[PDB]
């Protein structure tokens, strides 16, 4: 499966070193809070959190944003470029307002993840790597998202919508485009990873402090 995204930069009017980007004062406070989580003389350890903060502020990572992060942390811009191109959660290209990521790995594929993907494609009228004309939705496929037992599932801006059906995902998309924020979590009546039929364990109240404490401890 071809990724479709290049790892080289061509200067454009919308993406060039002269594109204006600079952190807000609040984000500078957050940067100075992040920086002192690491030993002095190892400021380069903050590249990932600072780059993620820049992406959260700007919506994506322009080359000017990468250069700004490199300047703030006094690390080589090539090192920042390496990190940005290595990690897939960093958007080096503009995305939509809502970034749907459909998990397509085997545990989610055994359940009807293809139905979820097809329903999203028909509902939005876009392909699997395109963006809606109104710059509102972007759709991609991703690998395991850590919610395998709640398959199939999608992630839309760090929210997990699990136990999906085509009807449920269409309702979620409608709620998103209307303006409301759907409640993340399973859509099948479960609350979490518990079995659907009923609790096969942890049915009785938990034991209190000091239940089976060792004699000496």
């Amino acid at each position: 499966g071809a990724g479709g995204a290049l790892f080289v930069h061509r200067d454009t009017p919308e993406n060039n070193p002269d594109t204006p980007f600079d952190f807000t004062p609040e984000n500078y406070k957050r940067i100075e809070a992040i920086v002192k989580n690491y030993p002095e003389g190892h400021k380069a350890a903050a590249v990932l959190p600072v780059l993620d903060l820049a992406q959260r502020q700007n919506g994506w990572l322009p080359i000017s944003a990468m250069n700004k992060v490199a300047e703030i942390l006094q690390v080589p811009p090539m090192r920042v470029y390496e990190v940005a191109t290595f990690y897939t959660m960093y958007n080096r290209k503009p995305v939509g307002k809502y970034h749907i990521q459909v998990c397509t790995t085997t545990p989610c594929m055994l359940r009807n993840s293809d139905s979820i993907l097809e329903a999203i494609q028909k509902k939005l009228g876009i392909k699997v790597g395109e963006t809606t004309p109104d710059k509102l939705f972007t759709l991609i496929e991703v690998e395991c998202l850590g919610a395998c037992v709640n398959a199939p599932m999608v992630q839309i801006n760090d929210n997990y919508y699990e136990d999906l059906t085509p009807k449920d995902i269409e309702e979620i998309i409608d709620e998103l485009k209307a303006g409301k924020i759907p409640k993340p979590g399973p859509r099948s009546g479960r609350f979490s990873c518990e079995p659907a039929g009923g609790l096969t364990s942890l049915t009785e109240p938990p034991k209190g402090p000091g239940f089976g404490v060792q004699a000496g401890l």
Partner: protein
Amino acid sequence: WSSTADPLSNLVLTFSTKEDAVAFAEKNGWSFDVEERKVPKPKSKSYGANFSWNKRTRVSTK
């Protein structure tokens, strides 16, 4: 084409030892210049030095 008038332009001889080479040159009468063999000096290599806590050997990339 490239011409020549020197019979010994392509002549290269192989010897196992400097003493053997010098003996051959002396008995055949040619003048000779001897260059001592250069061997690389032993070098201390360590993979763990790439991640030094306080030294400058720490690498910024892999």
